[PDB]
Design a protein around this nucleic acid. Structure first.
Lengths: 197, 136, 191, 172, 97
RNA sequence: GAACUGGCGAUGCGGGAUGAACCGAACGUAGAGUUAAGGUGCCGGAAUACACGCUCAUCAGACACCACAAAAGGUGUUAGU
RNA sequence: CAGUCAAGCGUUCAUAGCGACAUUGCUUUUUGAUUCUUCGAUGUCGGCUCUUCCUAUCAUACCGAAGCAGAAUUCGGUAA
RNA sequence: UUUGCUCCACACAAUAUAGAUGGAUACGAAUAAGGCGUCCUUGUGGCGUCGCUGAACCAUAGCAGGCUAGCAACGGUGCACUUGGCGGAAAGGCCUUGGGUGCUUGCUGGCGAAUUGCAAUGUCAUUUUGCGUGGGGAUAAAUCAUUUGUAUACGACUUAGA
């Protein structure tokens, strides 16, 4: 439908999100994601951790170097589980990696257009009233990610800039609504409300 | 200075509250609660629409903030007896809820010739609103 | 069995007022304030008539129903602590080595000094929380009082004193020497 | 097993020289279809009296339905379920519109909570309930109090597409 | 990580830093920063352009400087250059020093 | 080491991740529609279908052949007699 | 090697530490069992050497028990 | 080392494509709650409203989109400039001012087509490069031969020298 689909990682579910994303890229869709640190896990701080701990102890016995790669980046974290459900081995899955793009926060070109969501992939919707979970931002920090407040400093400058522009936009739509109401109830307004609009 | 704890307005499950069917043999008709069974299933009945008094799930029907007075056990007669004795018909199509339906309902029944009329009446509609957002 | 309807009732002592939006509380009154986050349990509250507000659950499990009772209990202790307050007592026990307590302050941190805890050649301290202020108890031999709004900062600071005196590699039943909490009440008298 | 229906089986073994046409019995079976109910007859029959599908027969096999399929009713039940240890006696009281209706839900209940199979449940007798107060089951007492009115928090939806260009709220 | 934005300089240098750039210095023309000193002919609108650009964004300060190996008993003559972080107050006031 | 019937040897084909044998089925080269065993978030084909509920696990579980698990307890919770 | 029922031993108390008559398991560092594999070859044992992994933890760091007064010991827990 | 080389207005051949063919349309937190309009003492204040899918919204009529008359307004969009402000996370783009300028399908006209003979995309995309045009700008370095020990099995490492 559009040249590219922008994805909002805040408030979604880890593995289920990649699944639907996967299908769309294999159908012909270039895609860029933002704020992957805000992807929400489930369970306790303790649990989700030790799983990464035992994943952390499994590496090529004779060559820790040319074997398994672990990540502190919440973005290539999504890269990991999603590439592991396709064949990155053929030119097929190689071109799918090249279509896909993930980011730590919402960079310069990608926040000048809006991002979207999904219900069947939403954390809030697939969560029963009164359940536990863990967030990547906090656990990314406990695993070895030295960039929490460095990037929490970036989101500060950012959320201010985006709200200043919606200040002008919220007021400019107050102009559009007060021009459409004075020109309303006329001859072309009556005839159009009948056609279905 | 006092308390103030929001509003917390919800649609309560009761005998007299009406809902909108999305799927089944109706898939777009109305029916009100006659009796309550449990948590997800209830008993409906809507004569002014053409639908039966049937056991049904909450996952196949929606809600409305419209409630009128009704006896606990009132069959088909008392069902539309209090329907008209409350004036819920004019109170129903009195909201943007059902205006939204007829809007896209008439869009799926639009010819390219009448769809052509919408395009042209809007050519002149947006012209006056541009000479409006230019001087005010 | 998902309890259909479980609800408790609560009284407000006239003059006090509380502001609420979402699952965030505020207790403003006679001595001070107490903000609280409850967006980790998921419940409802409704103001019925000035000095009365409720709590409810509709289709909630026994662990969520044991939590409806557990919070009406909390609402109660926040109102009396603002008007009456929370006053506790702790006596030092010894039978040989004098228990010396001081009021230290480096750069403005406010701790509590441990001198001669059983011939202690090392200096132990006790960090003070925010909001509650202490006062050395007289007329009585070896005691002191804590005073504030919430039971958490007062009794967890009192539990600070408790385990700070650990009898390591000794017989607890015999070498019973340390600081224990004696009194547990309010700052007001009669109550 | 399937969607339920209730039948009415009638038999008399086989008539003889000495004394033809035996006592003549009847039963209330619950089977999605006709033939299913024929086995359930012989089932409890070759367990109480002396017979078989070879020394006797069945005359009629018709279905019996609930008169008022619009009104929800209460129902009490006699069950003899056989566990991985043995047979026990339990008493249930679920409120459903029709008779064969509460049977389908209680059979589904036997596996979701009791882990017992279709061929592992025994229906002794189900006398419909007429009087409140004589209520000894508590999940029942919650729907039997005056003014059953309660709010419905948390409202999820079913997505027709693959996306969402917003942040839809969950009010109800 | 730590991203490097602007790279600033001086006007005149030493042959130690100019030869630090050559491999074949016995046959060089010596065009070392010849057009960079053209940014010193003009009043200096571009010099402060990048200088104050840094006083606005850049978080830290690290400065380059070369050695005095001519006064040293070594025939290499080639002076090395490295960055030395500034541990003072306010990053804007650090550029001033 | 023997009794029954059946297989493989001397058998590919879909399936069981894969495996001589277990299930279904046996085979000239195609072309269409229909089902077998098994499944159906993604790999990977196919409903993030609908239903009635059970479980929160500081080393969960997640389907025969078969890939291992027991006594014995628990005021975790559940239906209970 | 780890239990579990617990007559009892323990001055007086079954369960501080143990525990008979019994019964439930785990292991392949014991020997057995087998011929599946290899006798047109896989270089027996031990040792010196060097590295890594398990925990059924002997010691240390932090901790509970006692028939722990002091002192020390025995049992137990997280953990290689 | 023949006139070589870099950015632009471009002249033609090409070389392929992981996949052009109206717009990727920009608060924040929250979801047992919320956005928006509104008043006042700007409070966690009162009042009204919406949701149940973006099936939204904006744009869209002309030889793949023409020649040109008149009304009405002084407005909109595209093109190339000019003024000023902003943008560092992967800025290189967003915001706005003044003139020039084409459309002006916001209302009403004059004419053009065919036969391409009942279907055959019947091309109006862009990655990059080679070679001729003329208008600005710039006069490059590295290798080895040689020497050095802060280096070395060997290349490499490292000094120097018109």
């Amino acid at each position: 439908v559009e040249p590219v689909v922008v994805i909002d990682g805040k408030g979604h579910l880890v593995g289920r999100l990649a699944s639907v994303v996967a299908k769309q890229l294999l159908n012909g869709q270039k895609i860029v994601v933002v704020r992957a640190e805000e992807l929400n896990i489930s369970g306790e701080f303790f649990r989700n951790k030790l799983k990464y701990h035992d994943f952390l102890r499994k590496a090529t016995a004779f060559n820790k170097t040319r074997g398994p790669f672990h990540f502190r980046a919440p973005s290539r974290i999504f890269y990991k589980a999603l590439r592991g459900m396709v064949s990155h081995k053929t030119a097929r899955g190689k071109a799918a990696l090249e279509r896909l793009k993930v980011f730590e926060g919402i960079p310069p070109p990608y926040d000048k257009k809006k991002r979207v969501v999904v219900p069947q992939a939403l954390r809030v919707l697939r969560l029963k009233p009164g359940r536990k979970y863990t967030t990547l931002g906090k656990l990314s920090t406990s695993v070895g990610w030295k960039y929490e407040d460095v990037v929490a400093k970036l989101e500060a400058k950012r959320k201010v800039s985006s709200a200043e522009y919606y200040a002008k936009k919220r007021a400019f739509t107050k102009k559009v609504a007060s021009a459409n109401a004075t020109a309303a109830e006329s001859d072309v307004a009556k005839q159009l409300a009948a056609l279905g609009y | 200075t006092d308390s103030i704890v929001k509003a917390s307005n919800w649609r309560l499950v009761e005998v007299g509250r009406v809902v909108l069917i999305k799927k089944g043999q109706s898939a777009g008709k109305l029916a009100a609660i006659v009796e309550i069974i449990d948590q997800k299933k209830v008993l409906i009945d809507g004569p002014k629409a053409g639908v039966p008094r049937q056991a049904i799930n909450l996952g196949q029907v929606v809600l409305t903030p419209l409630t009128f007075a009704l006896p606990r056990g009132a069959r088909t007669a008392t069902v539309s007896k209090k329907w008209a004795a409350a004036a819920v018909c004019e109170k129903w199509a009195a909201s943007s809820w059902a205006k939204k339906i007829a809007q896209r309902e008439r869009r799926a029944a639009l010819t390219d010739f009448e769809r052509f009329q919408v395009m042209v009446l809007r050519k002149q509609k947006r012209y006056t609103v541009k000479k409006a957002l230019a001087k005010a | 069995m998902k309890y259909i309807q479980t609800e408790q009732q609560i009284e407000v002592p006239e003059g006090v007022t509380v502001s609420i939006k979402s699952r965030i509380v505020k207790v403003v009154g006679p001595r001070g304030t107490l903000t609280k986050n409850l967006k980790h349990i998921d419940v409802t509250f409704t103001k019925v008539n000035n000095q009365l507000i409720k709590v409810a659950v509709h289709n909630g499990g026994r662990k969520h129903v044991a939590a409806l009772r557990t919070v009406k209990s909390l609402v109660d202790n926040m109102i009396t602590g603002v008007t009456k307050g929370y006053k506790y007592k702790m006596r030092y026990v010894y039978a040989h080595f004098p228990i010396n307590v001081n009021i230290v302050e480096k750069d403005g941190a406010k701790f509590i000094e441990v001198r001669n805890f059983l011939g202690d050649k090392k200096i132990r301290n006790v960090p003070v929380r925010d909001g509650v202020t202490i006062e050395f108890s007289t007329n009585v031999k070896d005691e002191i009082v804590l005073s504030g709004n919430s039971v958490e900062d007062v009794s967890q600071n009192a539990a600070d004193l408790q385990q700070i005196c650990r009898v390591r590699n000794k017989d607890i039943r015999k070498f019973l020497d340390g600081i224990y909490v004696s009194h547990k009440g309010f700052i007001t008298e009669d109550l | 097993m399937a969607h339920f229906k209730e039948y009415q089986v009638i038999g008399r073994r086989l008539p003889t020289e000495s004394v033809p046409e035996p006592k003549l019995f009847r039963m209330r079976i619950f089977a999605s279809n006709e033939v299913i109910a024929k086995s359930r007859y012989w089932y409890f029959l070759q367990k109480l009296h002396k017979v078989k599908k070879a020394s006797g027969e069945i005359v009629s096999i018709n279905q019996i339905n609930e008169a008022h399929p619009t009104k929800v009713k209460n129902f009490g039940v006699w069950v003899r379920y056989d566990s991985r240890s043995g047979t026990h006696n339990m008493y249930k009281e679920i409120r459903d519109v029709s008779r064969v209706a509460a049977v389908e839900t209680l059979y589904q209940d036997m596996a979701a909570r009791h882990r017992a199979r279709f061929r592992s449940i025994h229906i002794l007798k189900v006398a419909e309930i007429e009087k409140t107060a004589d209520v000894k089951r508590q999940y029942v007492k919650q729907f039997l109090t005056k003014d059953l009115k309660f709010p419905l928090p948390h409202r999820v939806q079913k997505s027709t597409k693959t996306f969402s260009y917003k942040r839809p709220s969950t009010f109800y | 990580g730590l991203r490097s934005l602007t790279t600033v300089w001086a006007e005149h240098l030493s042959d130690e830093v100019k030869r630090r750039f050559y491999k074949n210095w016995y046959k060089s023309k010596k065009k070392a920063f010849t057009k960079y000193s053209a940014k010193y002919a003009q009043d200096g609108a571009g010099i402060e352009r990048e200088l104050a650009r840094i006083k606005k964004y850049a978080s830290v300060v690290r400065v380059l400087v070369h050695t005095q190996i001519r006064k040293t008993p070594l025939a290499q003559k080639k002076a090395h250059l490295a960055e030395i972080q500034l541990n003072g107050g306010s990053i804007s006031e650090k550029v001033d020093w």
